[PDB]
Structures are given as structure tokens and as C-alpha cells.
């Protein structure tokens, strides 16, 4: 490990954290890594990180999971820190201020957070005017490797759930490599239960008419992000579903409502979505269940409670072709970055994988 490392994990941020409520921690971490002021990022990608998947080269397969910037703030800021692709979002048609303050939760105890926003968003309007600034600078990211995705949101008061995705895919899908469909946020009235099978048909098949009536250099790939509180039917129907419609991938998972016995944190019966360690392996197991419904020729993006090289390995093995984490960044702060790929590069090596590419759903194949 680096001497970097350390300190923001044992020091710096602890104390950052005892000083600042979370969400005042969460805007003053958007605008430090929007002007750039970060460590050194000190990794170098080898050759053994790269995937490609989604139609796009990715140089690592470590992201930065939606939430961190809802309006596509730092998109810059976090490549710097060494993201191998950016995830912006949830972004909402209208502007919206979400719940009342206070509505983000630590529980240092358990390595955790509970959320419950309700989709604050600049809306569709702001956000494209901020990504068409950098259009064509990102258009040369992508191609050297470094993707941006779009996490598309609903208004709390719409009356018509399906045209707002469609709204987003209109407005965002011409800026985005991919565009994720949420519809697991635990923190809107009814969200969740568009994940059901007829609810979810009706809603991708809008979706992707819209997707494909873009022109060809602006049609993104669309993605739907899941819960990681579905049933067992659920799950079979989601894979029904992506299969019917050629669906391009999931993201799995969102945050959880469910409060694992052991934890810890006072605040661990605050209403909202669950994040981090306490996640981990609710979402690994997820994935590992996705996979195998869809045969594995579904790319999925693994996200929850990764804050290690074994963290993304075990869901890369699960099955995913990238990995997302958000919490540990919020706990450990930017060195986090380097440190899981360092230690995701390591332990391929040690594996005898020749890539993060043969790890894929190795796992399956045991
Ligand atoms: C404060 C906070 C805000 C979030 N906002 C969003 C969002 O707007 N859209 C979304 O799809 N997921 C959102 N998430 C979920 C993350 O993208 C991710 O799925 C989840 O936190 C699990 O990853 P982690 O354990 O690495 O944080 C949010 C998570 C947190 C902690
Ligand atoms: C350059 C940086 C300075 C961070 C100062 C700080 C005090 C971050 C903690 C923190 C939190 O405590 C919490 Cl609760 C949240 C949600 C977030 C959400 O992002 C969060 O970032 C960052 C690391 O990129
Ligand atoms: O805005 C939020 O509350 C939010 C959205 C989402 O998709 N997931 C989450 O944990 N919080």
C-alpha cells in the first residue's frame, strides 16, 4: 500500500467526516473533484485491466456508481481520480429537490450508508446543457477508453413513468455511451415495482424504440439497474424480459432495504437504501444469479460494497464485465481507486487469469 492510502483512510477522512454532516461532506467532495484538487493518481492501467464490452473500450473496469454526481458536475474530476468509466445520475426530466434535509445517514460501524434522496436532480435540461459543454472532449475519452454512462430517473409527480425514461433517452441518450434505466431506487413512491414483468416490458419496449430511432454515432446502449430485494420470481422475469427484448445489460445492484441482522450504526433503522460492506455479498450473490439466467451473454455491471481488489474480483468471477463502487470512496476517499486495482491486478496474477477478461464468470465454470 501507499502512504496516501493510509492517511486518507486512518486520518484525513475520519476526520473530515467528524467535522461535516454527510451531505455537506457529499457537495464538498462533487466540487474538490470538479476543480481537480486530488492526489496524485499514481496506477498506471496495464493491459490486463482493459475490457470491451457495451460496443466501448474500457481501460479498467472500475467505475464510479450513480449518486456521487447527480449532475454531471465532475465527470473530468473523476476520470482523474482513475475511474475507468463515469456513471452520472439519476437525472430527473424536470428539476426536483428530493427529501427534506437531513436524508443521507453514516454508519461508520458497519462500513455503511443509508440514503434516502428521492431523486434531487438538476433535470434533463441542465445536464445536457452541461454535457454538450464537453461533448466532443468526451467523444476522445471514449474512444481512449473511457466511457460515460447516463442514469435516467423519474419525477416524483409524473403521471406517466415510461415517458419520462423515454424523455431521458431523448434528451441524455445522444450524450451517453450507455443509458441505465433505474427503476430500483428505493427512495420513490411505486419505482420498484416497475421491475415487475408486464410493468417492465412495456416500459424497455418504449425505452428502446426511442433508443433506436437516434442516429447511429449518438445511440447508446441501454441498461436497466435492478434491487437487490427481488424475488426469486422477479429475478426469472427481469431475464425473461432482457432476453426477449435484447436489453444490452443490467446493473446490479441499487441499494437495499433490507437491514442485515448485525448492524451496528445508530442509525441503522433511518428509512432509506443501504450501501457498503453490508451489501456486498447480497449484491454478489445477485449477480451470480443473473448471470446464470441469462446464460451469461447479458454484460452486467456489479456494484455494491466493493471497496477491494477482492471485492471487484468476486463479482467479476460472479459474472460482472465491469464493477461500480461509491460508499468506499465516501469512507476511504480517493485512494480507494488505485488501491482496488492495484490489489484486482494482483490477484489476477495470482489466480492465473491473463486478464480481467478470462475472470468473467469464471466462477460458472468451476
Ligand atoms: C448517497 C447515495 C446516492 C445514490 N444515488 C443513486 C442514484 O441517483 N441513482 C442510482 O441508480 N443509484 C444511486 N445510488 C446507488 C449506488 O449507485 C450503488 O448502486 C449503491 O450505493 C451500491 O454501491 P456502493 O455499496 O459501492 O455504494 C446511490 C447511493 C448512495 C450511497
Ligand atoms: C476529494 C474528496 C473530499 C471528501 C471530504 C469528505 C468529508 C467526503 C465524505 C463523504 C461522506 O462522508 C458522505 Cl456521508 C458522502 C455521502 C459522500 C459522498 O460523496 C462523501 O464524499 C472526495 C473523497 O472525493
Ligand atoms: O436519489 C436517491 O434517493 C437514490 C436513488 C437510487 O437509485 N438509489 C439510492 O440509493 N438512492
Redesign the pocket.
Known amino acids: 500500500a501507499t502512504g496516501d492510502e493510509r492517511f486518507y483512510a486512518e486520518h484525513l477522512?475520519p476526520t473530515?467526516?467528524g467535522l461535516?454532516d454527510?451531505?455537506s461532506?457529499?457537495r464538498?467532495?462533487?466540487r474538490?473533484?470538479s476543480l481537480g484538487?486530488?492526489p496524485r493518481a499514481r496506477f498506471q492501467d496495464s493491459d490486463m485491466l482493459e475490457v470491451r464490452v457495451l460496443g466501448h473500450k474500457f481501460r479498467n473496469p472500475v467505475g464510479i456508481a450513480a449518486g456521487?454526481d447527480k449532475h454531471g458536475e465532475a465527470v473530468d474530476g473523476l476520470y482523474k481520480?482513475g475511474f475507468g468509466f463515469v456513471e452520472i445520475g439519476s437525472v430527473t426530466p424536470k428539476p426536483q429537490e428530493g427529501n427534506p434535509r437531513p436524508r443521507?445517514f453514516?454508519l461508520p460501524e458497519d462500513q455503511a450508508?443509508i440514503?434516502r434522496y428521492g431523486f434531487n436532480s438538476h433535470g434533463l435540461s441542465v445536464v445536457e446543457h452541461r454535457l454538450r459543454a464537453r461533448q466532443q472532449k468526451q467523444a476522445k475519452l471514449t474512444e481512449d477508453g473511457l466511457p460515460l454512462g447516463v442514469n435516467l430517473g423519474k419525477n416524483k409527480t409524473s403521471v406517466d413513468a415510461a415517458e419520462d425514461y423515454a424523455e431521458g433517452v431523448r434528451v441524455l441518450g445522444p450524450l451517453a455511451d450507455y443509458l441505465v434505466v433505474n427503476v430500483s431506487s428505493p427512495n420513490t413512491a411505486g419505482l420498484r415495482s416497475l421491475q415487475g414483468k408486464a410493468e417492465l416490458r412495456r416500459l424497455l419496449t418504449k425505452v428502446l424504440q426511442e433508443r433506436d430511432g437516434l442516429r447511429r454515432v449518438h445511440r447508446p446502449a441501454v441498461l436497466v439497474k435492478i434491487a437487490p430485494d427481488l424475488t426469486s420470481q422477479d429475478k426469472e422475469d427481469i431475464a425473461s424480459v432482457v432476453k426477449e427484448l435484447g436489453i444490452d445489460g443490467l446493473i446490479v445492484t441499487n441499494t437495499t432495504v433490507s437491514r442485515p441482522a448485525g448492524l451496528q450504526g445508530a442509525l441503522r433503522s433511518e428509512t432509506g437504501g443501504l450501501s457498503g460492506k453490508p451489501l456486498r455479498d447480497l449484491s454478489t450473490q445477485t449477480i451470480r444469479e443473473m448471470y446464470a439466467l441469462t446464460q451469461g451473454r447479458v454484460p452486467i455491471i456489479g456494484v455494491g460494497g466493493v471497496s477491494s481488489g477482492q471485492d471487484a474480483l468476486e463479482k467479476i468471477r460472479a459474472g460482472a464485465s465491469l464493477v461500480q463502487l461509491?460508499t468506499a470512496?465516501?469512507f476511504w476517499?480517493?485512494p480507494v481507486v488505485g488501491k482496488v486495482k492495484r490489489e484486482l491486478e494482483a490477484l489476477l496474477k495470482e489466480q492465473g487469469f491473463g486478464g480481467v477478461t478470462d475472470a468473467i464468470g469464471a466462477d460458472h465454470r468451476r
Open positions: 477522512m473530515l467526516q461535516l454527510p451531505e461532506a457529499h464538498l467532495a462533487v474538490f473533484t484538487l486530488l456521487f481520480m443521507v453514516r450508508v440514503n461509491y470512496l465516501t476517499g480517493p
